[PDB]
Every structure is written in structure tokens, then in C-alpha cells.
């Protein structure tokens, strides 16, 4: 029953503005397990007072909650420590053992540090802090490398120290309906699976659009680009949920095993199935929509970093083969959308004596077929690791195959630095995206 | 082989010929959808002339002055022969009158049986024995009723199918509106697209609805002899089920798809009296129009009538693909709207929170939803010219159809139960929505 929630880097913005508040909300709605201590670790010489002061801004505290807020802060504590230094972890372990049932408690470690220090911490948590009786679960944060080779080093490290069932790689930086995406597509597989195949579907597009640009933090993004930001992780996860086979059960590792069989059968995307974009500002429109990506302090000058990407993948296997899977995601477009389109073959020529137009299944609140021509993301991902559900967290093999697919392309965008086709903030994207789609059988 | 066509309206004197058949061939001539060389010969006991038939029909033709040139050209090709229905002499005259037309000899002949099915036996016998072209094809259109039950249907069926081949027999049904072939075409399309889904592994409950917003519209006396189950369920709604529940056909031929339809029927068991709710519409005081007037306030409806004007019924397809999957048929006159829709509800179960049953809804693009030029008659007439039997009930399709509803129908005649009062423009009786919940229709 008893749980300890340890935030490493409890001083930083992620802990301050996101982690502390989102476990506040979770405890404030009786969603946390009854007996749950929150514990902060960092270098800074802080107390429970310092950490209410800096972090209650983002809590959205009211007059009626004044009693609960104090019951939450009764169960918090802090511990000074270098991330480099063993005795620091030794002090932390003993702190937790002293707490009520602290010797028997399950332990949930949130790594809210940069991945440069990840090696040191995994090795020290592993050496000194693991429960002898409870479960031990590490929440590791993006980025999980920037390429196959770098992701393979950081990962092979964590996975020599931690079983796969103690590793939770979290992704939440693409909005609060981001888990919802993964649940309806998984549901739409259970309903429509028998129809989702090459004998019924001529084309699939997975669209993920953000209407807003990189709004000042383009200094963190210019290191990564859109393929690493959205495509390699989220779109690919939603591709898998569409192309996978009804799983052997409803257990995390049976569906994860099925998302990987897809990924294994996707070969390395080459550059002439790729259309990259970059958002140049809008003269003709109000708000931050006047600011091109380039025109931002944090973005280096003449940086040829992709803001938009359209890609053609193929899932070379008996179920799908020659069925083009189109991935289309971008910043600073005309709307906020996550849609999958499954365009059928022209199957009604005889019935209606005329040439009838093409049919198509669309998912975005039951969704539809046409004819062309409270728990919110972060909240739900926290509970999932308290509940031991790894459904929505990427696996080791899953993550390697992900990078295997895009890594040759990405190294070519570093070496040869091509120029992203510019496109107006608010527009649908480069029009060479629409052409690529037509040439591969989109309507 | 040839380009010429004779259209023989047996009972051209009659009310169907006047208000529907002449108009609907007129409109087809008006739009050049008929063959270039089409003669139109009417036959009945009445001593009439083309001008007599012109005068009674032309009110229904809704003719404009632009069409007068086209319309003389039409009534030109019109002839009329008087004659009795079991008098061999008479039929001789008709054969001769056709033979005395340009290429009658080797023209295709199309016989519209616009008579009550009491003269069918003699009219069919005599057409076979006398009036059939010997180079051209010979096709018969038979009108409803296709008898009133299995035994009455089988007798007429057997007779006709001892004289004519199944490929000469066209059983036309066209009294349930204009988007009525449409209805059938789109449930076939969706079958093509959603077939692999449509089965007991994936689907909890199937429901096919046929609502009309109006009553018997003064012609209650005709309806009262038949009931809602003979008028809608045993014909058009049972075809909509066949089209949903049937196997990937072995080809895109009439006879192949109709084979697959019959396979579903063969496996449908006799509908049981305690899986049936019957309605009859009483008037709407607060309403206005015909909506003021109930079934029994039709002056042609005999007093004390219990004829069902609405019915819910529950069938099962007992085979592999379906089983413990109730098919619910719900139809009626004088209802809240005009609807022909199929609902397929899936099984209930990712969202760690009871998330409510989903269901696929084909209304006549349509959708999944989380719950809680030509018209029918023109098309069907063309279909017999152009030779397609796709949208016409095959003899054995029809035998099964009667087999399913015949025990219940006879139960209804014997026990004479009191159908439930439902207000004109109502949804139908509540006891219908109860039946559905007990078999799990959400
Ligand atoms: N889209 C994204 O993927 C995205 C967006 C937001 C955040 N993040 C993730 O957030 C994580 C943490 O960021 P944050 O917002 O919490 O702030 P941060 O300032 O990057 O790091 C948080 C804390 O870590 C410690 N720290 C920082 N740099 C360090 C270094 N070089 N060596 C040792 N300790 C160091 C500091 O705590 P003390 O000095 O007090 O010990 C600092 O307050 C990163 O891993 C990043 O990947 C990424
Ligand atoms: N909703 C429906 O299902 C529906 C509705 C309309 C029609 N129908 C069907 O359409 C067919 C014809 O309908 P209708 O309204 O045109 O019928 P009808 O007017 O009663 O019969 C048409 C012609 O048949 C002849 N006739 C009538 N009763 C006869 C009898 N007992 N014996 C011999 N000849 C007789 C008369 O011509 P002569 O005296 O000049 O020979 C009459 O002009 C029927 O089979 C009917 O069931 C179906």
C-alpha cells in the first residue's frame, strides 16, 4: 500500500511548474494511493517552505482547499545532495526508511534532470536507493538520445541496471489529449481491425497539427527539429496502433510486442519520400502569427531546422504492403488536429451504375466515414506508473526501431543541411507535401 | 440480337396503369431511357381506345407544353386491344395485333400483370400458350400480393414457374417510396466495405428501421386486408437484413448475390409470437392535416379492425457468422419522421472507465456513433428492359420469407390481438422499446 514519490531535481522548472502541481491535483482529487509520501532531491539547500513558496503559484490554490494543501505538505520532505555523490543517496535512502512503513514502501523515482547526468543517477539509485520489498520504478524524461547510436548508449545503460518493467519513458509535450489519441486508435483497432489491411485500404495518413509556432523556446527545438519532436515518437506510436494485429491479450507487453512487429517491418525512410518545412511569419495576420521561426532570439540565424515534415513510410508485411502510410505533422498551421484517414479501394463501381467517388474512414465523440476528392495526459501517465500499466510508455526495442527508421535521414539533414521549403504561419504547409501525397495515391 | 420492344399492360383499364404505369413509361420515353423502337399495347375487358386511356392518364402525366411534340410521338406507339382473361379467341387477336406491328415477329415482349392475382393463373397460362415472341425474349412483371402466406404464395409461385423460367419472372415491389432501390444499393455497398466486421465476434445487436411520417392516406381499405408485416417486413425489411447478414458473394451476378441472400433466409427460424409488438395509430388532437385522423377514422377501414399499422419483431440468423445476435425489425405508418436505417451495435469494453457501447449507423456518408437520377419504380422497370433481376425477389427467396412470417401471421388471424394505440407522429408504442432492451438494444 505505502508509496514514496521521489523527485530528483525538485528545484527545476519541470518539478516546480509541472510535477509538484500535477501530483498536487492528483492528491487533491483522492487519485493518489492513500499512504503516499512525496520527497524532493536536488543540490540546492531547500526545505518544504522554500518549495511551497516557489511552486504554489502554479498550484491554482483556492480558499476551500486551504485544509487539504496543508495535509499534502505534511507528506512532503526535501534532501540536499550532489547527483555525482554516493553518500547523498545513502542519506536519501535512510530518510525514506525512517518514514511510516518507509522500509516496505513501493518507490517511484521521477528523473527531472538533463540526460547528461542520467548515467550517474540510474547507477546511484540502483546502488543505494532501491526498496528490498516494494517495487522500484524510474520515470525517465525526453530526449531518449537524438539518434540510434546515442539513444542506444543512454538506454543500454539504464537497462543493465533496471528491468523493462521498472523503466517508464514519459512523453507529454504534445498536449493534454495526447494519451486520448493512443486510446481511441487502440479502440478503433478492436472495432475495425479485420478491415484495416491492403485488400481494403489504399492509403493511410496520420495528421498531427499545432496551430502555434515554437513561441520563444525554439532554442531547445533547433537542436531537435519536428521529426525528433513529434514524428519519431508520437505519430509512429499512432501508426503502430493502426497497423498492429489484435493483441494476444490486453496486457502492456502483449500490445507493445505487437507495436514492435510493425516497426521491425518498416525500412529506413529515404529523402525523396520526405518534404520538410519552416514557418516564415504572417504579415497579414494578428498575434504571434507575425513571427517566423527564424525571427526568435533563441533560434540561431539561417538555421535550416525543419518545423514541418511530411513522410511516406511502408509497412512491408502480408497485412500492409505497398499501402503508403503518410505522416504529416507541423508547427504554426491552420488548426489543432490529430486525425487518421483510411481511404478504401474503389469498391462500388457496379452497384451505383455511375462512377461513385472514393470512400474513407476518419478518426479525430464517435468519428465518421466520408467521401473525398478528468485525467489529462500527464495526470494519466503518472497514475499508469503508480498502477504498473506501461501501455502508454515506449519500450526499449520499440525505441530502437523508431530511431533505426529515421536515423539515416536525420544524419543526412545534419551533414548536407538542405533548406526547408518556407511556409506562411497559419497555412496548411508546403504545397510539395500535397504533391508527394497525390503521387503515392492520396485523393 | 435486335432493337425493338413491345410493352403489354394487361389491365390497362385499371387504376395502377392510369396513376403509375403509363406515367412512368411516359417519363422514361420523355427522357429517352426506353429502347429507340418501343411499342406499348394495352389489353383488358373494357371496350376502350388509346384516346379513352389518354384522357384518364394525361392528368397524372404532369405534361408541360414543351413535351407536346415528344408526347404525340409517344401516344402514336400506343395501341389498345379489348379482351377477356380466359378466352383463347381474345388472346389470338392480341398476338395478331402485336405481330401486325413493325417487327412484332422478332421484337422482345414485356407483359405487365396489372391485375389482381385471381386472374394470374389464366393470364399466365394464356400468355405462354399464345402470345410469346419466337426470336425475342419474353419477360413477365407480377404485382403484389405475392399471396398472403406460404401456402397461398406457393400455389401461385409453382403455377408461374411451370410455364416461365426464373429468369423470365420479375416480381416488382415499389410501394415504399422513391429511395427504395437506393436503400438496397447502399446496404450492399456497406456490406462490401464492412463485411469482415459484421459478425457475432464483433457485433452485439443489429436493428433495421423503416419509418413513414404519414398514415394510410385514405386507402386504409386496401392496407387493412394485408397489415404492416405483409406490407414492409416480409418483403423490403427482410431484403435489407439479407443484404447486411450475407456472405461475400462468389460473383457480382444477380443469381450469385440472390443465392447468398437465400442462404441467410434458409437459416432464419420461424418468428415467434412473444418476440413481436404490434401498434395501430390513433389520431393527434393537437396535430393538424391527416394527423387529426386515426386509422379507424379512415372511412374505407371497416369498424373494429385490429390490423397492425406498426410492428417490432425479433429474428435470429442461426449459423456460425451470427448467433445470439438478435436482428430487430421495427417499422410503421404515421411515425415521428421518414427513415430507413440499419444500426449495428458493437460489444462493450482501454479508457479504465465504463465508456458506453459504440454502434455503426447506415441511414438512407453515415457514421460510427456512441449510443446509450432515376427513382425506384423507373429503375425497376428499366431493370427488366436492361435484364437485371438484382432488385427483384427470386421465387425461393420469397418461399423462405413466407416460411418465417407464416406461423405468426396465422397466429395473428386466429387470436386477433389488440395492437397498441400510438399517437400519429409518435415514435411508436413504448412496449417496442421494452422488447429491444430485453435482447440488449441499448
Ligand atoms: N519537450 C521536452 O522534451 C522538454 C520540455 C521541458 C522539459 N524537458 C526535460 O526536463 C528535464 C529537466 O528540466 P527542468 O525543467 O527540470 O530544468 P533544468 O534546469 O534543465 O534541470 C532541473 C534541475 O536539474 C539540476 N541541473 C540542471 N542542470 C544540471 C547539470 N548540468 N548538472 C547537474 N544538475 C543539473 C538543477 O537542480 P539543482 O542544481 O538544484 O540540483 C536544476 O534545477 C530535462 O531532462 C528535459 O529533457 C524537456
Ligand atoms: N401497395 C400495394 O401493394 C399495391 C397498391 C396498388 C396496386 N397493387 C397491385 O396492383 C395490381 C393492380 O392494381 P389496380 O389498383 O390496378 O387493380 P384494379 O384496378 O382492381 O384491377 C385493374 C384492372 O383489372 C381488371 N379487373 C379488376 N378486378 C377484376 C376481377 N376480379 N376479375 C377480372 N378482372 C378484374 C379491370 O379491367 P377490366 O374490367 O377492363 O378487365 C381493372 O381495370 C393488383 O395485383 C394489386 O395488388 C399493389
Coordinates of N, CA and C in Angstrom, one line a residue, chain A residues 180 182-184 186-187 190-195 200 344-345 347-353 356-357 359 361 365-371 375 380 384 389 391-392, chain B residues 182 184-186 188-190 192-197 199 202 252 346-353 356 358-360 365-370 373 379 383 388 391:
Chain A
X180 N -5.3 10.4 -25.1 CA -6.6 10.1 -25.7 C -6.4 9.5 -27.2
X182 N -4.0 7.8 -28.2 CA -3.4 6.4 -28.2 C -4.5 5.4 -27.8
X183 N -5.5 5.9 -27.0 CA -6.6 5.0 -26.5 C -7.7 4.8 -27.6
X184 N -8.1 5.8 -28.4 CA -9.2 5.7 -29.4 C -8.6 4.9 -30.6
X186 N -6.2 2.6 -30.4 CA -6.2 1.2 -29.9 C -7.6 0.7 -29.9
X187 N -8.6 1.5 -29.6 CA -10.0 1.1 -29.5 C -10.5 0.8 -31.0
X190 N -9.7 -2.5 -32.3 CA -10.5 -3.6 -31.7 C -11.8 -3.7 -32.5
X191 N -12.4 -2.5 -32.9 CA -13.6 -2.4 -33.7 C -13.4 -2.7 -35.2
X192 N -12.4 -2.1 -35.8 CA -12.2 -2.1 -37.3 C -11.1 -3.0 -37.8
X193 N -10.2 -3.5 -36.9 CA -9.0 -4.3 -37.3 C -9.2 -5.2 -38.5
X194 N -10.2 -6.2 -38.5 CA -10.5 -7.0 -39.6 C -10.5 -6.3 -41.0
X195 N -10.9 -5.0 -41.1 CA -11.0 -4.2 -42.3 C -9.6 -3.5 -42.6
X200 N -8.3 -3.8 -48.5 CA -9.5 -2.9 -48.1 C -9.1 -1.4 -48.1
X344 N -10.4 3.8 -48.5 CA -10.8 2.4 -49.0 C -10.4 2.4 -50.5
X345 N -10.4 1.2 -51.1 CA -10.3 1.0 -52.6 C -11.7 1.4 -53.2
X347 N -14.6 0.4 -54.4 CA -15.3 -1.0 -54.3 C -16.7 -0.9 -54.7
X348 N -17.3 0.2 -55.1 CA -18.7 0.4 -55.5 C -18.8 1.0 -56.9
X349 N -18.2 0.3 -57.9 CA -18.4 0.7 -59.4 C -19.6 0.1 -59.9
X350 N -19.9 -1.2 -59.6 CA -21.1 -1.9 -60.2 C -22.4 -1.4 -59.6
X351 N -22.5 -1.4 -58.3 CA -23.8 -1.2 -57.6 C -24.5 0.1 -58.1
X352 N -24.0 1.3 -57.7 CA -24.4 2.6 -58.3 C -23.8 2.6 -59.7
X353 N -24.7 2.7 -60.7 CA -24.2 2.5 -62.1 C -23.2 3.5 -62.5
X356 N -19.0 6.3 -58.7 CA -19.2 6.9 -57.4 C -17.8 7.3 -56.9
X357 N -17.8 8.4 -56.1 CA -16.5 9.0 -55.5 C -16.0 8.1 -54.4
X359 N -14.6 6.4 -51.0 CA -15.0 6.3 -49.5 C -13.7 6.3 -48.7
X361 N -12.5 6.3 -44.1 CA -12.8 6.3 -42.7 C -11.9 7.3 -42.0
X365 N -16.7 11.1 -28.4 CA -17.1 11.9 -29.7 C -16.9 11.0 -30.9
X366 N -17.7 9.9 -31.0 CA -17.7 9.0 -32.2 C -17.4 9.8 -33.4
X367 N -16.5 9.2 -34.3 CA -16.0 9.9 -35.5 C -16.7 9.3 -36.7
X368 N -16.2 9.4 -37.9 CA -17.1 9.2 -39.1 C -16.4 8.6 -40.4
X369 N -17.2 8.2 -41.4 CA -16.8 7.9 -42.7 C -17.4 9.0 -43.7
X370 N -16.6 9.4 -44.6 CA -16.9 10.4 -45.7 C -16.6 10.0 -47.1
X371 N -16.7 10.9 -48.1 CA -16.2 10.6 -49.5 C -15.4 11.8 -50.0
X375 N -8.8 12.9 -15.8 CA -7.4 12.6 -16.1 C -6.9 13.0 -17.5
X380 N -2.7 11.2 -16.2 CA -3.0 9.8 -16.5 C -1.7 9.0 -16.6
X384 N -0.6 5.7 -14.3 CA -0.3 4.5 -15.0 C 0.9 3.8 -14.4
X389 N 0.8 0.1 -15.2 CA 0.4 0.0 -16.6 C 1.5 0.7 -17.4
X391 N 1.3 0.6 -20.8 CA 0.6 0.7 -22.1 C 1.2 1.9 -22.9
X392 N 1.1 3.0 -22.3 CA 1.3 4.4 -23.0 C 2.8 4.8 -22.9
Chain B
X182 N -32.3 2.5 -54.0 CA -31.2 3.2 -53.2 C -31.0 2.5 -51.9
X184 N -31.5 -0.4 -50.9 CA -30.9 -1.8 -51.1 C -29.4 -1.6 -51.6
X185 N -29.2 -0.7 -52.6 CA -27.9 -0.5 -53.1 C -26.9 -0.1 -52.0
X186 N -27.3 0.8 -51.1 CA -26.3 1.3 -50.1 C -26.0 0.2 -49.0
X188 N -25.8 -2.9 -49.6 CA -24.9 -3.8 -50.4 C -23.5 -3.2 -50.3
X189 N -23.4 -1.9 -50.7 CA -22.1 -1.2 -50.6 C -21.4 -1.4 -49.3
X190 N -22.1 -0.9 -48.2 CA -21.6 -1.1 -46.8 C -21.2 -2.6 -46.5
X192 N -20.0 -4.8 -48.7 CA -18.7 -4.8 -49.5 C -17.6 -4.3 -48.5
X193 N -17.9 -3.2 -47.8 CA -16.8 -2.4 -47.1 C -16.6 -2.9 -45.6
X194 N -17.7 -3.3 -45.0 CA -17.7 -3.5 -43.5 C -18.0 -5.0 -43.2
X195 N -18.1 -5.9 -44.2 CA -18.4 -7.3 -44.1 C -17.6 -8.0 -43.0
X196 N -16.2 -8.1 -43.1 CA -15.4 -8.7 -42.1 C -15.6 -8.3 -40.6
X197 N -16.1 -7.1 -40.4 CA -16.6 -6.6 -39.1 C -17.9 -7.3 -38.7
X199 N -20.4 -9.6 -37.8 CA -20.5 -11.0 -37.3 C -20.5 -11.0 -35.8
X202 N -17.8 -9.5 -33.3 CA -17.6 -8.0 -33.3 C -18.9 -7.3 -33.0
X252 N -20.5 -11.0 -58.9 CA -21.3 -9.8 -58.9 C -22.6 -10.0 -59.8
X346 N -21.7 -2.6 -31.5 CA -20.6 -3.4 -31.2 C -20.7 -3.9 -29.7
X347 N -19.8 -4.8 -29.3 CA -19.6 -5.3 -27.9 C -18.9 -4.2 -27.1
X348 N -19.2 -4.2 -25.8 CA -18.7 -3.1 -24.9 C -17.4 -3.5 -24.2
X349 N -16.5 -2.6 -24.0 CA -15.2 -2.8 -23.2 C -14.6 -1.5 -22.8
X350 N -9.4 -0.2 -21.8 CA -8.5 0.8 -22.6 C -8.6 2.2 -21.9
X351 N -9.8 2.7 -21.7 CA -10.1 4.0 -21.1 C -10.3 3.9 -19.5
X352 N -10.0 2.7 -18.9 CA -10.1 2.5 -17.5 C -11.3 3.2 -16.9
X353 N -12.5 3.0 -17.5 CA -13.8 3.8 -17.1 C -14.9 3.4 -18.0
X356 N -19.4 3.3 -22.5 CA -20.7 3.2 -23.3 C -20.5 2.6 -24.7
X358 N -20.4 1.6 -28.5 CA -20.3 2.2 -29.8 C -21.3 1.5 -30.8
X359 N -21.6 2.1 -31.9 CA -22.5 1.5 -32.9 C -22.3 2.1 -34.3
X360 N -22.4 1.3 -35.3 CA -22.3 1.8 -36.7 C -23.7 1.9 -37.3
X365 N -22.7 10.3 -46.6 CA -22.0 9.3 -45.8 C -22.6 9.2 -44.4
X366 N -22.4 8.1 -43.7 CA -23.1 7.9 -42.4 C -22.0 7.8 -41.3
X367 N -22.1 7.0 -40.2 CA -21.0 7.0 -39.2 C -21.1 6.0 -38.1
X368 N -20.0 5.7 -37.4 CA -19.9 5.2 -36.0 C -20.5 6.3 -35.2
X369 N -21.2 6.0 -34.1 CA -21.7 6.9 -33.0 C -21.8 6.2 -31.7
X370 N -21.4 6.8 -30.6 CA -21.5 6.2 -29.2 C -23.0 6.4 -28.8
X373 N -29.9 9.7 -61.6 CA -31.2 10.4 -61.5 C -32.3 9.5 -61.0
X379 N -36.4 2.8 -62.1 CA -35.2 1.9 -62.1 C -35.6 0.5 -62.3
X383 N -34.7 -1.9 -65.2 CA -34.0 -3.2 -64.8 C -34.6 -4.3 -65.6
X388 N -31.6 -6.9 -65.7 CA -31.1 -7.1 -64.3 C -32.2 -7.6 -63.3
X391 N -32.7 -6.5 -58.1 CA -33.5 -5.8 -57.1 C -34.9 -6.4 -57.1

